[PDB]
């Protein structure tokens, strides 16, 4: 006859909500006695069988720019990073004035000797010690033309908390798992432009392998694409929104260094010892990064022919960074526990006008691109609340046989009748890397209650 309402429990309907998430790590990350920095004592392990079920005919809108897991991941990384430097050595008795000269006979033109006095394990006795501090960690306090007085940089503003020499900065993968009563929708569309509907949504509980790499201006190890180069942006109208280029073919990049002596152990009290840079044996060279020439050339050509779809009659150009200090204009990362800040002058020096150039030469692979750069030791990252460190050095030489995944670009402001616009690389906020690694997923809440029309009559 007429419609009578009936209640249903166990109904698959969805809403958008913001809740905290869990961890998930591999089984090999718990047998290590170095305790890592994230996945040994806090994060829970996962099962070795990630079940994924594809849904039939559902279309769901995705917005990777207005996301909750990016902000939660950033807050969790910041909090877990600040909690891992509390039981470590603090370099408060190192703000004494340093007397610094050239590095012996035949100076290296990059380090200063910087001999000082320090308090030993006895509170009365003091001893004269020496090191080799890097030049960007040395500030010339002066009142006249004095070339022998120097001090450390982090004693001026806030703290000198050294990292512990047991943990490591190795980026092992982690997975984010939704809590009970929540699911994660993942879009499998290959032509996903970042915002809009998706028609191959699959429901998963735990995310795939995410490596929280510390990098700016250029993306390190990460997940590749499937079909072609993908452009990620939210408006593509103004010049103040960072655009992400997601690649398809990796390009090999290595970074090397000359030798050092050892970790010179200097005591500043009971138990608190720090490892400074000792001597340098052998000849001194530069710390450089090598990138293949023809792979970078046809990769940038592929980026050009794919980016020409959004600009039909305009040529693209590249040049240097748009000014600033050391920390923002250089591609910065870390390897083996030592940080690198490297100039990108020889990578973004070119232009594309729409005419493709084919590179067919087998013997031309010998030519490479070299990036010469220096090393810092005190890191002021996260653009605030960073808990200013002092990275301990490594004894021998190191290698950085790495992989490249994406690029971060920013358009410059043009003038009238400017048909040739430029794209300069820039980093800035840390959220861009984890936003590039979390475009697929979206947290979702299920409501098991519902109503439906039928002809059910409850008996009395």
């Amino acid at each position: 006859e007429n419609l009578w309402v009936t209640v249903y429990y166990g109904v698959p309907v969805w809403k958008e909500a913001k809740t905290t998430l869990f961890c998930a790590s591999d089984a090999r990350a718990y047998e290590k006695e170095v305790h890592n920095v994230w996945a040994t004592h806090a994060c829970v392990p996962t099962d070795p069988s990630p079940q994924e079920l594809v849904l039939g005919n559902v279309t769901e809108n995705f917005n990777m720019w207005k996301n909750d897991m990016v902000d939660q991941m950033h807050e969790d990384i910041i909090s877990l990073w600040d909690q891992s430097l509390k039981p470590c050595v603090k370099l408060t008795p190192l703000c004494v004035t340093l007397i610094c000269s050239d590095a012996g006979s035949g100076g290296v033109e990059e380090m200063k000797n910087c001999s000082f006095n320090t308090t030993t394990e006895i509170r009365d006795k003091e001893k004269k010690e020496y090191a080799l501090f890097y030049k960007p960690d040395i500030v010339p306090l002066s009142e006249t033309n004095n070339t022998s007085e120097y001090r450390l940089i982090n004693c001026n503003t806030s703290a000198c908390t050294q990292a512990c020499p047991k943990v490591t900065f190795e980026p092992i993968p982690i997975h984010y798992c939704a809590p009970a009563g929540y699911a994660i929708l993942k879009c499998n569309d290959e032509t996903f432009n970042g915002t809009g509907p998706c028609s191959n949504v699959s429901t998963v509980q735990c995310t795939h392998g995410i490596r929280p790499v510390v990098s700016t201006q250029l993306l390190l190890n990460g997940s590749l694409a499937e079909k072609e180069i993908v452009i990620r942006s939210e408006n593509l109208t103004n010049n103040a929104k960072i655009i992400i280029v997601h690649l398809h073919t990796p390009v090999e990049i290595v970074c090397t260094r000359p030798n050092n002596n050892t970790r010179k152990s200097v005591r500043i009290g009971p138990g608190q010892t720090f490892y400074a840079t000792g001597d340098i044996i052998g000849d001194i060279k530069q710390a450089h990064c090598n990138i293949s020439e023809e792979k970078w050339n046809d990769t940038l050509q592929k980026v050009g022919i794919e980016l020409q779809k959004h600009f039909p009659n305009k040529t693209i150009k590249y040049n240097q960074s748009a000014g600033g200090d050391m920390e923002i204009t250089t591609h910065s990362f870390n390897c083996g526990g030592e940080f690198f800040y490297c100039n990108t002058s020889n990578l973004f020096n070119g232009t594309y006008n729409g005419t493709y150039i084919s590179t067919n030469s087998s013997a031309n692979s010998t030519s490479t691109i070299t990036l010469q750069c220096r090393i810092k030791q005190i890191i002021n990252m996260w653009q605030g609340v960073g808990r200013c460190m002092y990275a301990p050095p490594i004894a021998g030489n190191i290698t950085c046989r790495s992989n490249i995944t994406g690029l971060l670009l920013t358009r410059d402001g043009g003038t009238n009748s400017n048909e040739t616009e430029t794209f300069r690389p820039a980093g800035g906020d840390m959220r861009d890397n984890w936003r590039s690694e979390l475009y697929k997923y979206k947290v979702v809440k299920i409501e098991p209650l519902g109503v439906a029309p039928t002809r059910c009559k409850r008996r009395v």
């Binding site: 419609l3 309402v5 009936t6 429990y9 905290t20 849904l55």
Partner: protein, 123 residues
């Protein structure tokens, strides 16, 4: 089928799978956050169970209530609802009317229970 096996399937065929989406509602730095989330999940399930039990539909998945359905709410034929539509569009176009439906179910349960105690007391 596990999570959301019939989230876009046939309306008549989505009534055979409510058990698997209802079986799994409970299954220092991070000693408080997961605790708060777990207690929140427990109270979400308990609120759902109490809301089911407040109109006499506890322990039964598909329960029936004698309150009628007004023509100003859906005005659509039953056959193509149960054979063509899905749950998500139904939640899209019914969720603005849910509170008065819940109130009607509560009033109908109150009337049914008051007739039940009147019949028990008069006998």
């Amino acid at each position: 089928l596990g999570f959301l096996g019939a989230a876009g399937s046939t309306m008549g065929a989505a009534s055979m799978t409510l058990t698997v989406q209802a079986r799994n509602l409970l299954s220092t730095v991070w000693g408080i956050k997961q605790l708060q989330a777990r207690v929140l999940a427990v109270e979400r399930y308990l609120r759902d169970q109490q809301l089911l039990g407040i109109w006499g539909c506890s322990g039964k998945l598909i329960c029936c209530t004698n309150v009628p359905w007004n023509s100003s709410w859906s005005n659509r034929n039953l056959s193509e609802i149960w054979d063509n539509m899905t749950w998500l569009q139904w939640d899209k176009e019914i969720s603005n009317y849910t509170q008065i439906i819940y109130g009607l179910l509560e009033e109908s349960q109150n009337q049914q229970e008051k007739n039940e105690q009147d019949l028990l007391a008069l006998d």
